[PDB]
Swiss-Prot record, chain B:
The gene is Kcnk2. The record marks 73 as: pH sensor. Residues 190-193 are annotated as: Selectivity filter 2. The keyword Membrane applies. This is Potassium channel subfamily K member 2. Detected in hippocampus astrocytes (at protein level). Detected in dorsal root ganglia (DRG) neurons (at protein level). High expression in brain and lung. Also detected in kidney, heart and skeletal muscle. Not detected in liver. In the brain, highest expression in olfactory bulb, hippocampus and cerebellum. It is found in: Cell projection, Axon; Cell membrane, Sarcolemma. It comes from Mus musculus.
Length: 274, 251
């Protein structure tokens, strides 16, 4: 346990980075959202105190219980209303295959989750089998797309061969054209599809794309204009293969910037200003 | 040359088709039952209080739907819960940022935090893989001398011991028996539908994520086996079915 003592040292130092990284992230979000929280929730009270004055003969003390039972309904697919009390299935022939696609990709929006105990015991096994299953598809799609990218770069790697185009530095031009194409084909072009057909802004589509393809976790949901749902699960498959490489390159960038800063502090703790 | 991805593609498509037909068979019954009882509870309430009516109540539903998008959240802790979701990609959509700056931050915060957290989880996986490597070394002497199949007893003790330390024992810290195991699997498969109480719970995640990371990879190894086992099995069956057609030609 000589290198294993050197392992725990490296892990513990990373642990404190993630902790602080999460502390930085926390303080940033609460500085950006709790302003927008208080604003809406000072106006949710105005709408309560509006509607209790507007209709006093409703049960004040039991109205919140009506609100809670609507919120307790919200977790399941509910759009309860008198005009069009007749409704449509969130577990129809397709929306359950949307759901299955979420579970194996581990995207899992949680927009709809199974309520049956048979659906839970199936989903557990369906995930424990589907997640590794989908992995080998995604890996093959990554290799399939990595050789497609390997084909296109070979032609680009001959178009501008000048005198001693430095081998170490050509690899940077190649990774620039990767991010350039990739963040058009899997970020830009499909996101603009989610702006005319779903009704979003420019950010909210790119935000949607990153949240989904970073498998954090809807395109099938909002409806403006059945050619549209089968194709999106192909962009997901290849886009997930894309960010898988994108997140992995960023990981490689973080190794570099770890050792460069690790040796840098090494010299500054050596010299102490001459 | 040989693609071999297309063949997998059709399995996943087929697997998703089976899974789909199973879920609607399990949920659309439990869907109709609820939503016929939701209409009864509404048609009770409109009759129980004529003070409220159709044209009022829909406005009450809309202002709850308008509330849904927001709902103290985002407090000093609930934003670091949120950040913990984004880097682990568990990402419970329980709370999501509404500000344009919170979205542009979250994008970059994920693009940087997900790989970052990966190296933590990787080291925790190696740290826990040698801890598991310690425990097996002593088990590999207590009865391995006494009377390829030993490797199964070891992986049985893995599932046995790990699905107590990371599923059963923690389960409450965080219902019923199912609802805890369902919770554990959903969370640690990253699907996600010295002082205060906060720090210790978040390390169960870290080590439990390292646990299912090995569990899911082990299952991947069994799928690779069962792929080759069935790959060669059809291999023989097409050999005999051809020689079967060949004999009726000669004889
Ligand atoms: C092994 C070659 C991979 C093919 C993927 C590139 C697609 C190029 C688009 C034009 C050709 C469409 C072929 C459709 C294949 C079902
Ligand atoms: C709730 C259903 C999941 C039970 C998992 C049991 C695992 C048994 C493994 C046997 C492999 C041959
Ligand atoms: C890697 C080169 C593949 C070229 C395939 C052609 C696709 C159509 C491009 C249209 C250019 C006008
Ligand atoms: C009912 C079993 C579901 C698994 C999918 C069938 C496995 C065989 C696929 C064909 C492989 C060559
Ligand atoms: C979020 C940036 C943190 C930088 C860590 C440097 C500590 C040596
Ligand atoms: C904000 C830049 C993150 C890089 C951190 C490096 C940790 C060694
Ligand atoms: C809106 C532009 C996002 C910039 C991403 C940078 C990640 C390193
Ligand atoms: C690189 C993954 C190997 C998959 C096994 C395929 C052997 C025919
Ligand atoms: C050829 C792939 C076989 C997949 C078997 C899956 C069993 C759950
Ligand atoms: C809930 C029993 C399992 C069905 C596949
Ligand atoms: C080296 C690329 C940085 C993009 C923000
Ligand atoms: K995930
Ligand atoms: K997720």
């Amino acid at each position: 346990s000589a290198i294993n003592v050197m392992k725990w040292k490296t892990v513990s130092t990373i642990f404190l980075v993630v902790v602080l990284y999460l502390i930085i992230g926390a303080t940033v979000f609460k500085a950006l959202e709790q302003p927008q929280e208080i604003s809406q929730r000072t106006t949710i009270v105005i709408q309560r105190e509006k509607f209790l004055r507007a209709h006093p003969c409703v049960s004040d003390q039991e109205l919140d219980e009506l609100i809670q039972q609507i919120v307790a309904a919200i977790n399941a697919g509910i759009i309860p209303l008198g005009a069009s009390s007749n409704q449509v299935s969130h577990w129809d022939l397709g929306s359950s295959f949307f759901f299955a696609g979420t579970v194996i990709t581990t995207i899992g929006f949680g927009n709809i989750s199974p309520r049956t105990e048979g659906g839970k015991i199936f989903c557990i096994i369906y995930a424990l089998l589907g997640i590794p299953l989908f992995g080998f598809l995604l890996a093959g799609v990554g290799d399939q797309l990595g050789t497609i990218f390997g084909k296109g770069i070979a032609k680009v790697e001959d178009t501008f061969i000048k005198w001693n185009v430095s081998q170490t530095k050509i690899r940077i031009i190649s990774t620039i054209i990767f991010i350039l194409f990739g963040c058009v084909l899997f970020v830009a072009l499909p996101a603009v599809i989610f702006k005319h057909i779903e009704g979003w802004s420019a950010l909210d589509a790119i935000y949607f794309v990153v949240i989904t393809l970073t498998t954090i976790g809807v395109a099938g949901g909002s409806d403006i204009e059945d050619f549209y749902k089968p194709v999106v699960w192909f962009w997901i498959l290849v886009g997930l293969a894309y960010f898988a490489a994108v997140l992995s390159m960023i990981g490689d960038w973080l190794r570099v910037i770890a050792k460069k800063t690790k040796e840098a502090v090494g010299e500054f703790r050596a010299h102490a200003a001459e």
